[PDB]
């Protein structure tokens, strides 16, 4: 559930 | 390459990003705990070269695997690299 | 290799086997679901040629990844190879 | 559990 | 691969064969004068190790183009090869 | 790398461009119809990193092969890149 | 990688610079007269990819060896390259 | 290649050998220390294969680098392998 | 003869 | 048309 | 005793 | 001056 930019 | 195969990238990076998103890891509910991208931004380094979609599975970064990484692990990973970074992936499914 | 690191060996099979034995699957109680080594056979060809040691992680052969393979699948895709198998690893740790 | 030759 | 992608493939020789025939070249009618699988031989290196199949197109052969290569000439340059041989690849459409 | 020898650049754009022209294609007069470097820029990516020269045929771009390409097909290809840019080449004649 | 293996790294310039100094050369007192590592420079290209670290040292340049080479020699050869460079070394002891 | 390229080559052994001999070691009094191939063995492997010549340098073997081997040590570093072995070169010239 | 920037 | 064993 | 930048 | 067989 957990989305991040790089 | 169809869906399965392993392949590698050389990205560069714009505005210093690599133009995805990425989910999951050991701690999350997202498949086996591992890392796929979730979303390739418009315009960021990621769609321009055009290998990398939603859905392959990242398995290193710069010649370290991300296994057992947690999200927050993986995450650091993918950021604590220079300009151009070397990826090994796998195919998803569209 | 250092303990995280990826690594690839072509192998060429001694007495038609790659001298090792594998264990993990997406159906197992090992590490992740993973396909590790478990041992390294005498006078097999892993041993011989000193790249591969037990706790080596096997991601891929011959280009397709082992991810979300049972022990069955994995098992079968490392037997349905030629005389030389290229195979890509995690370094465990010893 | 399972270990197999290859 | 898909149709069109670059692979790579260390192929050990059965009986001193890469257990494929070959058909093309810059002096035939085959498709753009290359180099291409015809058949994949029964129990032979290249089905074995199932990577190469019928209408594959060889680039290169030991890191060296067989582009212009008359029919003769990559014959003899696949020929000319010791016990593994590192072939270079185009995916043909099955 | 010797005429005839196969080689790979990981080239990174300058001003947005690969820094080469290029010539031929399967509906062309050029040799065989293959994809070749007419020249190279003065103060662009390929002169600067000084693998790639005037002569040199591209097989493929990105994991993709140019065979059967049209110009213009090959041209965008080329085109529709990112900033680093991996190039699998045969080595020319000067 | 442990002390002694060979890696590979596709580094981004920065600044037009690899972020490195490097002592050796056939013409010094330095070990065998090899090209080393002897600082990564702060916020540099090198420090920010995070593989090679003091110590390294380095074997070839976008493909040709630094074997023989001068000290002056080696440096032309680490600055005559464009914004990306394909650098192979063998691991140094920490 | 060209002299001073560096290339590399999976080897498949014949009657248990490469099918060189070489010559250095940073004890001896051969080029810079370096190890070298003196000789390519009549039938044996190297010579099949078309790849390696005399004055080739050997680099690493199986991803260890053979700097600062002595003679012995880079000897059994090169017969303490499988039957296939992955070899870092630099051209000789003939 | 036909030659494209790239 | 040439077809050849390797 | 040559330190360089590159 | 040491020659070796591998």
Redesign the interface.
Known sequence: ?6 | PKPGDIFEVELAKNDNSLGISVTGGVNTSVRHGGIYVKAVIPQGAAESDGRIHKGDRVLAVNGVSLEGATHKQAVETLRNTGQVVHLLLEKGQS
Do not use: I, L
């Open positions: 559930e957990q989305v991040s930019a790089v």
